Design an enzyme around this catalytic site. Structure first.
Site, PDB file in Angstrom:
ATOM      1  N   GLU A 106       0.644  -1.368  -0.431  1.00 12.86           N
ATOM      2  CA  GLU A 106       0.037  -0.436   0.504  1.00 12.86           C
ATOM      3  C   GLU A 106       0.804   1.403  -0.400  1.00 12.86           C
ATOM      4  O   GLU A 106       1.055   2.098  -0.811  1.00 12.86           O
ATOM      5  CB  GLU A 106      -1.131  -0.120   1.383  1.00 12.86           C
ATOM      6  CG  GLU A 106      -1.994  -0.751   1.198  1.00 12.86           C
ATOM      7  CD  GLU A 106      -3.093  -0.741   0.165  1.00 12.86           C
ATOM      8  OE1 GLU A 106      -3.220   0.049  -0.943  1.00 12.86           O
ATOM      9  OE2 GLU A 106      -3.485  -1.695  -0.079  1.00 12.86           O
ATOM     10  N   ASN A 133      -7.541   8.666  -6.333  1.00 11.87           N
ATOM     11  CA  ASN A 133      -8.788   7.252  -7.323  1.00 11.87           C
ATOM     12  C   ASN A 133      -9.573   8.518  -7.798  1.00 11.87           C
ATOM     13  O   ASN A 133      -9.292  10.350  -7.836  1.00 11.87           O
ATOM     14  CB  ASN A 133      -9.915   6.920  -5.920  1.00 11.87           C
ATOM     15  CG  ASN A 133      -8.345   6.339  -4.684  1.00 11.87           C
ATOM     16  OD1 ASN A 133      -8.433   6.959  -3.627  1.00 11.87           O
ATOM     17  ND2 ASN A 133      -8.037   5.136  -4.901  1.00 11.87           N
ATOM     18  N   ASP A 157     -12.513   8.027  -8.482  1.00 12.38           N
ATOM     19  CA  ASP A 157     -13.379   8.797  -7.961  1.00 12.38           C
ATOM     20  C   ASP A 157     -13.383   9.827  -7.734  1.00 12.38           C
ATOM     21  O   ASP A 157     -14.516  10.162  -6.773  1.00 12.38           O
ATOM     22  CB  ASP A 157     -13.878   7.817  -7.536  1.00 12.38           C
ATOM     23  CG  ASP A 157     -14.001   7.240  -5.996  1.00 12.38           C
ATOM     24  OD1 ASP A 157     -12.569   7.941  -5.533  1.00 12.38           O
ATOM     25  OD2 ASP A 157     -14.338   6.221  -5.235  1.00 12.38           O
ATOM     26  N   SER A 217     -11.908   9.933  -4.609  1.00  9.34           N
ATOM     27  CA  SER A 217     -11.386   9.828  -3.342  1.00  9.34           C
ATOM     28  C   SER A 217      -9.633   9.702  -3.438  1.00  9.34           C
ATOM     29  O   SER A 217      -9.350   9.591  -3.863  1.00  9.34           O
ATOM     30  CB  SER A 217     -12.014   8.972  -2.377  1.00  9.34           C
ATOM     31  OG  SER A 217     -11.789   7.617  -3.602  1.00  9.34           O
ATOM     32  N   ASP A 253      -6.403   7.742  -1.064  1.00  8.93           N
ATOM     33  CA  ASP A 253      -5.460   6.866   0.459  1.00  8.93           C
ATOM     34  C   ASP A 253      -5.017   7.940   0.761  1.00  8.93           C
ATOM     35  O   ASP A 253      -4.155   8.240   0.439  1.00  8.93           O
ATOM     36  CB  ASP A 253      -5.582   5.980  -0.873  1.00  8.93           C
ATOM     37  CG  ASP A 253      -6.283   5.270  -1.587  1.00  8.93           C
ATOM     38  OD1 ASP A 253      -7.504   5.290  -1.020  1.00  8.93           O
ATOM     39  OD2 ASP A 253      -5.863   4.995  -2.298  1.00  8.93           O
ATOM     40  N   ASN A 305      -9.228   5.245   2.770  1.00  2.09           N
ATOM     41  CA  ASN A 305      -9.568   5.983   1.999  1.00  2.09           C
ATOM     42  C   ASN A 305     -10.159   6.833   2.405  1.00  2.09           C
ATOM     43  O   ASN A 305     -11.084   6.616   3.375  1.00  2.09           O
ATOM     44  CB  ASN A 305     -10.299   5.022   0.785  1.00  2.09           C
ATOM     45  CG  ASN A 305     -10.198   5.546  -0.286  1.00  2.09           C
ATOM     46  OD1 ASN A 305     -11.953   5.296  -0.542  1.00  2.09           O
ATOM     47  ND2 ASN A 305     -10.326   5.751  -1.313  1.00  2.09           N
ATOM     48  N   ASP A 321     -15.498  -4.395   9.719  1.00  2.00           N
ATOM     49  CA  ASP A 321     -16.285  -4.241   9.012  1.00  2.00           C
ATOM     50  C   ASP A 321     -17.255  -5.291   8.067  1.00  2.00           C
ATOM     51  O   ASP A 321     -18.038  -5.086   6.783  1.00  2.00           O
ATOM     52  CB  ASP A 321     -16.227  -3.082   7.616  1.00  2.00           C
ATOM     53  CG  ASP A 321     -17.520  -2.646   7.130  1.00  2.00           C
ATOM     54  OD1 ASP A 321     -17.993  -1.904   7.339  1.00  2.00           O
ATOM     55  OD2 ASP A 321     -17.664  -1.935   5.511  1.00  2.00           O
TER      56      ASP A 321
HETATM   57 RU   LIG Z   1     -18.639  -1.967   4.109  1.00  2.00          RU
END
Ligand SMILES: [Ru+3]
Ligand SMILES: [Cl-]
Ligand SMILES: [Cl-]
Ligand SMILES: [Cl-]
Ligand SMILES: [Cl-]
Ligand code: NA
Length: 129
Positions: free
Chosen positions: A35, A46, A48, A50, A52, A59, A101
């Site tokens: 990473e 990113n 989109d 966003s 990181d 993110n 998550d």
């Molecule tokens: Ru989730």
């Protein structure tokens, strides 16, 4: 800060990641290697919009606030800049929430593509933990 391999393993252990949700230390160290190359200041934008942040490239779409990701959440309740600190507390505490998550460490695409199913213990080999 750019960590050494064993220096990060030690810090991650101290912070409660060794076998956190069943993931041995080597998994965490492998993930950080790919990473961020163990650099707490790493960022990556990113497609989109966003971004990181940090040693585990957490993110902004879900996990931290950077003020520039439209429609995002801040589930770790931290500014994303906290994830770039030499002190890995904020990254580790936030990683614990992400790995909890539901998808385990598959949340980190680089873990799934580069570490999962590999000999991850090799990342902590020969470290004084
Ligand atoms: Ru989730
Ligand atoms: Cl991070
Ligand atoms: Cl935002
Ligand atoms: Cl799991
Ligand atoms: Cl690889
Ligand atoms: Na956010």
């Amino acid at each position: 800060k750019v960590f050494g391999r064993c220096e990060l393993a030690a810090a991650m252990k101290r912070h409660g990641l060794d076998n956190y949700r069943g993931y041995s230390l080597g998994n965490w160290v492998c993930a950080a290697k790919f990473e961020s190359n163990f650099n707490t200041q790493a960022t990556n934008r990113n497609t989109d919009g966003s971004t990181d942040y940090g040693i585990l490239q957490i993110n902004s779409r879900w996990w931290c606030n950077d003020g520039r990701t439209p429609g995002s959440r801040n589930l770790c309740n931290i500014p994303c800049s906290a994830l770039l600190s030499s002190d890995i507390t904020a990254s580790v505490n936030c990683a614990k929430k992400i790995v909890s998550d539901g998808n385990g460490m598959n949340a980190w695409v680089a873990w799934r593509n580069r570490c999962k199913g590999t000999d991850v213990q090799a990342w902590i080999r020969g470290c004084r933990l």
